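Dear colleagues,

I hope this message finds you well. In preparation for our joint manuscript, I am sending the SLC45A3-BRAF fusion protein (Homo sapiens) sequence together with its predicted structure, so that both groups work from identical material. I would be grateful if you could confirm receipt.
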Amino acid sequence: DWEIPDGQITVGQRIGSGGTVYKGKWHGDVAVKMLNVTAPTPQQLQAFKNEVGVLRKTRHVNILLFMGYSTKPQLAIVTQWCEGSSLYHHLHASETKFEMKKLIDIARQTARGMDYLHAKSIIHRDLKSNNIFLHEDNTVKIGDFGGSILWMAPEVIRMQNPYSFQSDVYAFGIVLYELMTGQLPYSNINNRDQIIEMVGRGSLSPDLSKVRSNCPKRMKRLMAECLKKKRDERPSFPRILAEIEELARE
Ligand SMILES: CC(=O)Nc1cc(-c2sc(C3CCN(C4CC4)CC3)nc2-c2cccc(NS(=O)(=O)c3cc(F)ccc3F)c2F)ccn1
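The corresponding structure tokens are as follows:
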């Protein structure tokens, strides 16, 4: 089994909270995600092992690698350590001058991981650029599927059956929007309640006039399909992947 016994992991620097993520040492570098629980009930332990079971179904280069789990001294999930920062950081904080070639590659890699998860019947539920780690600045690692409102599909935003393969697709659409515009959607409306109301009712959607000159018109159309307010009108990942790989040639 994939349990790591007590004392094998050396916990280092805290990364962020929400439980808590640390850098650790275990046969090299790992990320250690501490759930806020020291004496699990024989009921929490079962929802934990249940979630571990989900993570263990993934083996793919664009999905954060599951490496094991801890019961003692604390419930914790152990993964590979990623170097660098999230796609969100690159796109919106540091303004990494990515050529359109790289931008497309990132989308393609994101599409690969999502298509993979969907094949294994896993709905992400929280895809956003903060959750796409750009390991060594090259490889997309999709994490955080074991504050999100800009990526929420109208049906999800309707305060709510809403989490589906198609809500993931919509969130992926917002990610394409981020990539192809360099911007977060609704940037000229800094109002959470307003966005919840307007996106929820279908009166507001991302401003597509903002996708850059360089964006293969074929990508812009694909992004529009992913963002269909009408959930059934959205493409599936197999189709999204096929599409992105083909335009990636030209
Ligand atoms: C430099 C660095 O931060 N490296 C790093 C970080 C992680 C992180 S970061 C991070 C958060 C921190 C809080 N915020 C904002 C402050 C930034 C959002 C992202 N989470 C991870 C992380 C660590 C372990 C598991 C997950 N996700 S998970 O759904 O539990 C998961 C576990 C698993 F075993 C396999 C896949 C998987 F998605 C993480 F997302 C994972 C691997 N490497």
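For the figure legend, we might mention the following. The beta strands are 10-16, 20-25, 29-34, 66-70, 76-80, 132-135, 139-142. The first helix runs from residue 44 to 55.

With kind regards,
E.M.
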